[PDB]
């Protein structure tokens, strides 16, 4: 059940795809085949229907959401909000982000339990994550790297970051999320590891060009297997 899926042109999968325990959302790129492939592993438990960002292609790094809520920026139309209101349920509350800041998925890196906010942005998304994400809200700069939603990823059983993580930052975040970490790579050293990967409890996804040691890292830390 280790998922290597090459998105033909783009090596970053999760820029067009985003998932938590409550859904599966993938963009309109290339066909319905990529869309429906998650069934024979996941199933229809977390539904999947294509949706976009105001028509623009990359849906993954747009929004901040996890199993308790979904949170959408200004840049979407009211109509894609209709769509996320049409098939997608109300038990995951989708609430709009009104501010100048577009990219939530390039900021907010969360899972079922722990969330974050970029320390540079002020309190709005911070506590509104208590309204929408409703999970633990706090801040960290990992090496002050831009896009605090870039290098990071989480799960119930751990998280994944890249080897550039310092011991202050490693042990720091390990303590934050209350589960172990393994700093690792994905897709053969994604220059941002966490922008192309998506993850949930038992599943974490990457490309056909992903190397096996990266996948023994990822699975063997989170035990994606059974």
């Amino acid at each position: 059940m280790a998922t290597r899926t090459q998105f033909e042109n783009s090596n970053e999968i999760g820029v067009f795809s985003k998932l938590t325990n409550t859904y599966c959302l993938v963009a309109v790129g290339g066909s319905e085949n990529f869309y429906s492939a998650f069934e024979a592993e996941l199933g229809d438990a977390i539904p999947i229907v294509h949706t976009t960002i105001a028509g623009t292609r990359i849906i993954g790094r747009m929004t901040a959401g996890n199993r308790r809520g979904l949170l959408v920026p200004t840049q979407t139309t009211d109509q894609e909000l209709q769509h996320l209101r049409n098939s997608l349920p109300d038990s995951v509350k989708i609430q709009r982000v009104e501010e100048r800041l577009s990219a939530l998925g390039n900021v907010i890196c969360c899972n079922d339990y722990v969330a974050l906010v970029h320390p540079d942005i002020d309190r709005e998304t911070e506590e509104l994550i208590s309204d929408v994400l409703g999970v633990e809200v706090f801040r960290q700069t990992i090496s002050g790297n831009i896009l605090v939603g870039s290098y990071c990823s989480l799960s119930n059983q751990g998280g994944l970051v890249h080897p550039q993580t310092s011991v202050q930052d490693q042990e720091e975040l390990s303590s934050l999320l209350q589960v172990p970490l393994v700093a690792g790579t994905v897709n053969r050293g994604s220059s941002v590891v966490g922008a192309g990967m998506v993850v949930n409890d038992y599943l974490a996804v990457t490309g056909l060009d992903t190397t096996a040691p990266e996948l023994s890292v990822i699975e063997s830390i989170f035990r994606l297997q059974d």
Partner: protein, 336 residues
């Protein structure tokens, strides 16, 4: 440029002519093989569409379009054409034994000075115990492989009043010529709307002469031919909220506030189509449907509007409806 179009000089006709027809079929209903509009106005429409795999798929899109004023048209007479190893040939023109005023006006270049004695022999003589068209029409029944039908507009029902109505013919795609000929025989002294004629997502053609400019060969004023124009909206001239979309749901007359540029409003249906419809404005244009079976994922699609432009485009187009216009203006100088 192309040597396709030679020689250089002007199109001798103000109304163009129809140089093709869809072949025919014997097993169909009797069908009206073509129709001619009046292009009135240019505009721009926003919408979205279903085009799987294209980069515009399920994605809101904006493009300009053309509107064409389309009066529902009235039919008088039929002529069957025999086929001969030279070309076709007519047999006899027939009519409705009552004609409107304007088609009478087609037969006089000077109407006021004339005696209006035109039809009395033909249209009067048919008043009788019958046989008037009997012999000739049954002759069409026997002979005349292909059949065409006289068609002429009502221009008193258009805001541009020249009082004079054009003539044209259109074929019939039915079969077993009896229910062809009888068809229009039933349709003598009748009109035929655009309802049963076309419907949306159908590619057709509308072409005509183009914008006479002047002499420096002579540039323009040719009837060119541009096929593949997808009708976005088949109008209805009695339809309130002319521009009512699958989205907008507000009342707007497709004729803007204060009217079109050089037009009063729209009394009859219309066709909105993408792209360009040749000519200059105020024009009478020709409509020929596909000439063949084009079927493909490209032509089988379905249009979904967002918003139609009712704004008054003289100067910069700004508001839409005078109710909303007067809510945003609020009270002017003397208003309220």
């Amino acid at each position: 440029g192309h040597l396709g179009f030679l020689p250089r000089k002007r199109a001798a006709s103000i109304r163009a002519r129809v140089k093709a027809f869809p072949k025919d079929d014997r097993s169909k209903p009797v069908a009206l093989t073509s129709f001619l509009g009046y292009k009135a106005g240019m505009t721009t429409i926003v919408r979205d569409l279903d085009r799987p795999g294209s980069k515009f798929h399920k994605r809101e899109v904006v493009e300009a379009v053309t509107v064409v004023d389309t009066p529902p048209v009235v039919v008088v007479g039929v002529v069957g054409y025999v086929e001969t190893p030279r070309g076709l040939r007519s047999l006899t023109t027939v009519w409705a034994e009552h004609l409107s005023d304007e088609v009478k006006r087609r037969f006089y270049k000077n109407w006021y000075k004339s005696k209006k004695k035109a039809f009395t022999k033909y249209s009067a003589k048919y008043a009788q115990d019958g046989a008037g068209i009997e012999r000739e029409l049954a002759r069409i029944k026997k002979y005349a492989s292909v059949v065409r039908v006289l068609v002429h507009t009502q221009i008193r029902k258009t805001p541009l009043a020249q009082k004079k109505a054009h003539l044209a013919e259109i074929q019939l795609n039915g079969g077993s010529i009896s229910e062809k000929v009888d068809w229009a025989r039933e349709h003598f002294e009748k009109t035929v709307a655009v309802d049963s004629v076309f419907e949306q997502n159908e590619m057709i053609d509308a072409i005509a002469v183009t914008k006479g400019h002047g002499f420096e060969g002579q540039r323009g004023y040719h009837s060119r031919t541009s096929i593949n124009h997808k009708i976005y909206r088949v109008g209805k001239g009695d339809d309130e909220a002319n521009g009512a979309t699958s989205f907008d749901r507000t009342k707007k007359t497709i004729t803007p506030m204060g009217g079109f540029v050089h037009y009063g409003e729209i009394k009859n249906d219309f066709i909105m189509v993408k792209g360009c419809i040749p000519g200059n404005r105020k024009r009478i244009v020709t409509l020929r449907k596909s000439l063949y079976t084009n079927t493909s994922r490209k032509a089988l699609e379905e249009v979904s509007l967002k918003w139609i432009d009712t704004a008054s485009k003289f100067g910069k187009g700004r508001f839409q409806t005078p109710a909303e216009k007067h809510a945003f203006m609020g009270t002017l100088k003397k208003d309220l």
